[model samples]
Target: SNIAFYVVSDVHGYIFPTDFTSRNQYQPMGLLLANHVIEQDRRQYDQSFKIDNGDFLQGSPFCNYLIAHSGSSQPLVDFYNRMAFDFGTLGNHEFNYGLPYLKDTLRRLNYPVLCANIYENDSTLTDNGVKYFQVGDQTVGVIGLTTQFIPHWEQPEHIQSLTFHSAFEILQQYLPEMKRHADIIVVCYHGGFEKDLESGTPTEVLTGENEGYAMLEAFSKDIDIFITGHQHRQIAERFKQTAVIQPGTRGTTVGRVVLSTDEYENLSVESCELLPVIDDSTFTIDEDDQHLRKQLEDWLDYEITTLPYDMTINHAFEARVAPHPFTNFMNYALLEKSDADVACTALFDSASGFKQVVTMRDVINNYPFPNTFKVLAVSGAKLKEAIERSAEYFDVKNDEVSVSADFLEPKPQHFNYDIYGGVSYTIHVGRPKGQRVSNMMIQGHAVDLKQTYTICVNNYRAVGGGQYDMYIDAPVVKDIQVEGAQLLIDFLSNNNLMRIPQVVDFKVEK
Candidate 1:
């Protein structure tokens, strides 16, 4: 008997082929295209299972539109049901809207939602965290686990009632029971590898945020299949005795793992591969899906407020190295909303900045993540440290400034480098790492190391995500619950004539 598994992970709410970067845009990626690939491949196997690894809830303009309007996951859930997903796991973004919204969305799904490492009051957070399936006289057990470092990145109020344990620890406790009860075991983890897959060396900080490597090292012999996500990497190959796959995010590819039995009935991995979601000529979108997409298009086309001058970003990298109008505008918006002493924001990789005539599509394309604003009371010393960390994004060689390898390798973290507003500073990339940031002034006065100032930043940084540890224990001045997209919408809706505040003053050079 042969069994095949088709998996999608970190989809991030991209159901349509377009990324919504512009009107009537078409991208090779998206669930609609990927579903065609999976369906076509299913015919070759004796039996096939459709699985969702995680991160299916957020990140697209379509998701932002839904939150602003219906405030429900029914549209996405309905599509998932029609796709007939067998089961799914939870990604960290699933908690972005908080537990109640997640619970409602999970309840509406036709399949089970799994997460063995997360608990509430000593009970599993979801009922379908673990499952056992019988296939051809063989028992298959699957356990779903997510990165336990969510507390470091999520809002405290959003997950105050829950407790998260290490994915490695959770597997230790569950694997023995699973091995005893089933002939084959599968681990569906919503996390990525912390080490290089070939050399087994640490790739990033061993923060326990991602334990894919640790899990594979410990249980590769006992596990038949190991499916992972969260890093949005494309990987499909044999790791020791286990078949490992981490499909790229946004429905670019589908992870496939085939298993077959020998004469002795011993299960073994036959092949593992990633099928790109390119050819969709055989597929057709029905009227129901088309109607939903049209509604989305209308919402995205709604104009907000137009600026007298265009804030177009010609080069994305140049904007990050030096201050750009778009980043300044973002920080100005942050300062206006929170009234903090200073504000900071990152320019996303896909951000094309604003045009003279702005629309909801422009706002979402610039700021896609469902992140809120938080003002932190940070000491001047900690703020300098944070600035120094961002300064590492530069590598000045022979007076030519370029992005450092640290921000590009492993994965492109162009978003980690931030631009500050309400202050003036200089980044001397020729200097050492910690001393690169100098001439820091706030309100025309040299920043005092001992002085405590309130700085407004995104909720992700407030909770110490992106390796920004200086913000971990800072006093919370304000927790702006409104997400970024909505905040921009409200700001644009109220103000017609926008004025660009010259709050951001910074230079990047040797």
Candidate 2:
């Protein structure tokens, strides 16, 4: 008996419609394309099934708004189940909303979900309680493993009940058993790849690390085929003779691999393809799906416009040049509402140069972290240290290289650092690691090394995570009980605002 399987990964819960400019624009079409592929395969082949590797939920305004406001997973889960996915693995982002949400989403899934590496608080049992599945005559074993970088990026509270294990270790323990019970083994890993920047083989024409490729190199031989995500690269590479594929994020691309097995049950990938979701004349959006898309757009418009005002400033830096009119506005509101020495903010350009019209939708697109505000008391020395650590991202001795060895290495995508609003400093791009930062200024004056200052930052930063290593042990003065977006909205409402305040210029001194 012969069989064919169609696999896609990293949908990321994007149910809404979007234009070409939107990150999730291809999502609905991705669903349509998956169905189309399955239909075509069924016509040409005897037995076939559709499987999504992982990352089915979470991303975009719709998912975030639903999670933040309604605290409901049903909407997303229902939408996913309707897409008719046969099976899936758990991506690291699955645990972002916490275990309860993860479990509930799994419970609502129409197909079986698998994850071998993730465990509950005290046991080896998987968090979502899903096991492997049987596909056609072939009993295929499916497992899930996420990258180890979750600890630094995710909020601690979301994953307090669960623990993530090493992918390699987990696969070593499970491989023999999986091989025994199943004719073929597949790893629906949520991690991504690493590219050779100079050769441009697994090239990142952009700049960030390709995490999925790294995972492929580490665990390729153990599995027959690996379906990966997280780094959002579109890949179809053969590493260690195992076929590895990652369809780009937000469903911009769909990865398809045709697997062939001999009579003895040994499997090999005969063909692999990464299809782009182009908005050309070849494909048409299903009418019913198009209606669903419109409904999602309406909901987005209503939710976004309900807010009173725009939270972002036109020139975030100019606004901070002196008591930054915008910063002053936020500080006054914070002081009025809470007991803190001073409130500070750093406008991070989440989508740095794609300065398309930033509407309420744009605000939602940029600030996906869903963080809250907090105030920390730290000596001026600590503040300076934090600035220095941020400056460390750039290599002083070599203008092109970063201080961190990892940064000096070529990346798969752009690695633009997010900046804090009220803090001011200059980078000497070619000086040396420690000498990169100069003229460190906080609140329009040279930082007083001996004075202790209370600074306001988001919950993500105050916890001593992110790019700044210096603030990890800083004393928490207060945690304001307001979401970061709400604070921005309040700042905008209090002061009639329409433009962004200028904040940063890439001025480098040799």
Off by over 4 Å in 2: 16-42, 68-70, 124-138, 194-219, 263-265, 279-292, 299-359, 392-416, 443-445, 462-467, 497-508
- Candidate 1's C-alpha runs over 4 A off are 397-399
Candidate number with greatest TM-score: 1
What TM-score would each prediction reach against the true structure? 0.97, 0.77
The candidate that achieves the highest lDDT relative to the unseen native structure: 1
The per-prediction CA RMSD against the true structure, in angstroms, equals 1.4, 5.6
- Model 1: lDDT of residue 172: 93
lDDT of 2: 0.59
Instruction: Give me the displacement of residue 324 in model 2, in angstroms.
Output: 10
Give residue 112's lDDT in candidate 1 (0 to 100).
Answer: 96
TM-score of 1: 0.97
Q: Can you write out model 2's per-residue Cα lDDT over 1-510, one digit (the tens) per residue?
A: 445656667766654334323434553445555555455555565566677766667655667667656688776776567767777776666766676777777777888776666667666435442355665556777776666555555566776666767665677677778778886777777776556512426543222213555455555666677877776667776766777777776656677767767777655677666766545445566677676566555544433323334344555333322233334444455545555544444444342211223344554544455667667888878766665555555543444433344433343211223344445567666666665667766657777889887767666666554455465667777767676556555654554433444433224345
lDDT of 1 by residue, 315-426 (tens): 9988887788888888888999999999998898888898988888888888888889889998899999999999999997666998987788778897788899998999
